[PDB]
A paper describes a structure:
Monoclinic crystals of the DsLOV protein were obtained in the dark, which diffracted to a resolution of 1.5 Å. In addition, a noncanonical structural element designated as the N-cap is present that includes a N-terminal turn (residues 20–23), helix (A´α, residues 24–27) and a connecting loop (28–35). The most probable higher-order assembly proposed by PISA analysis is a dimer, where the N-terminal A´α helix is part of the dimer interface that is unique amongst [name] protein structures. The buried surface area of ~950 Å2 involves a set of interchain interactions between charged residues (D20-OD2…NH1-R119´, 3.4 Å) (residues in italics with prime refer to those from the symmetry equivalent molecule), hydrogen bonds (D20-O…N-Y122´, 2.7 Å, A22-N…O-Y122´, 2.8 Å) and several hydrophobic interactions between residues in the N-terminal cap (including helix A´α) and the β-scaffold of the opposite subunit (Hβ and Iβ). Surprisingly, the chromophore bound in the DsLOV structure is RBF and not FMN; where both are identical except for the terminal phosphate group that is absent in RBF. We suspect that the FMN bound to the DsLOV protein in solution got hydrolyzed to RBF during the crystallization time period of several weeks in acidic conditions. Mainly, residues in the 310 Eα-helix (N71, R73, Q76), Hβ-strand (N104, N114), and Iβ strand (Q135) constitute most of the hydrogen bonding interactions with the RBF molecule. The double occupancy of M49 is indicative of structural flexibility of the respective residue in the dark.
Light, oxygen, voltage ([name]) domains are widely distributed in plants, algae, fungi, bacteria, and represent the photo-responsive domains of various [name] proteins. Blue-light absorption triggers the formation of a transient adduct between the FMN-C4a atom and the sulfur atom of a strictly conserved cysteine residue in the [name] domain active site. Here, we report on the identification of an unusual short [name] protein DsLOV from the marine phototrophic α-proteobacterium [name] DFL12T. Our data suggest that photopigment synthesis in [name] is primarily controlled by blue-light with the short [name] photoreceptor DsLOV acting as a key regulator.
Residue numbers in the entry:
A (entry chain A), B (entry chain A): 20 to 139
The structure:
């Protein structure tokens, strides 16, 4: 039996590229990605599960935006940032990335949810 | 935002004493317990979250049944066992305990679900 992680998605997130990471595992890997995420980024499931989502960054991604996300994660707060991201074929898009922390009933950080939206 | 862990319950488990543990944390602690669990066992939420469910065992609990559960957990398989358990007031009941593993999309063990049923 597999956890239905999507049961923890918000209504906005249902048609989207959305992912969950597990910060209690080494390197905060993605443990779930939606099919829209895989379609927009050009990857298969095998290529992305268990990896940190850093692989969407590329040669012209701003390193301060990357550090901003890292700090935002440490803060355990809701945040949104526009960051240049790339697909497997190397094509680039501005990603409006929204991240929020999700807690267990004890109030311990359990997952991060991330939603990607290409800015048009 | 708190994960709705009960979204991962089976239909049988809805009216029951049911709990989830996190085996990736030290001592495989309960991260969720239903109100029926707290009512049947005589505890408050603060008294049980973050603890291993071993505290339901007591003076006449059979140590081989305890080891059977431990091995069943290591096996990552569905199992049921009748074990003598106790409430906070020291009263005892035969618990028909059913445990199953729950996996993430990668196929890694994520949680155990446990359902308690007093045998009448
Ligand atoms: C749930 C979640 C989703 C993320 N999604 C993206 C993303 O879409 N693009 C990106 O560049 N970084 C993303 N990151 C950031 C990346 O995984 C890493 O945290 C940063 O590179 C800072 O170390 C995400 C992080 C988390 C926790
Ligand atoms: C999800 C879950 C529920 C459990 N529920 C009970 C229980 O109701 N009574 C009990 O004696 N042990 C229970 N245990 C067993 C206990 O926590 C521990 O695993 C055993 O004592 C073997 O170490 C449970 C274990 C898990 C993982």
């Amino acid at each position: 039996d597999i956890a239905d992680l999507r049961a923890l998605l918000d209504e906005d997130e249902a048609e989207m590229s959305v992912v969950f990471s597990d910060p209690s595992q080494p390197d905060n890997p993605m443990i779930y990605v939606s099919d829209a995420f895989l379609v927009q980024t050009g990857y298969t499931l095998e290529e992305v599960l268990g990896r940190n989502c850093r692989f969407l960054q590329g040669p012209d991604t701003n390193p301060h935006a990357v550090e901003a996300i890292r700090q935002g994660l440490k803060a355990e707060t809701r945040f949104t940032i526009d960051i240049l991201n790339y697909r497997k074929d190397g094509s680039a898009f501005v990603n409006r990335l929204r991240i929020r922390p999700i807690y267990d009933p004890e109030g311990n950080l359990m997952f991060f949810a991330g939603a990607q939206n290409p800015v048009l």
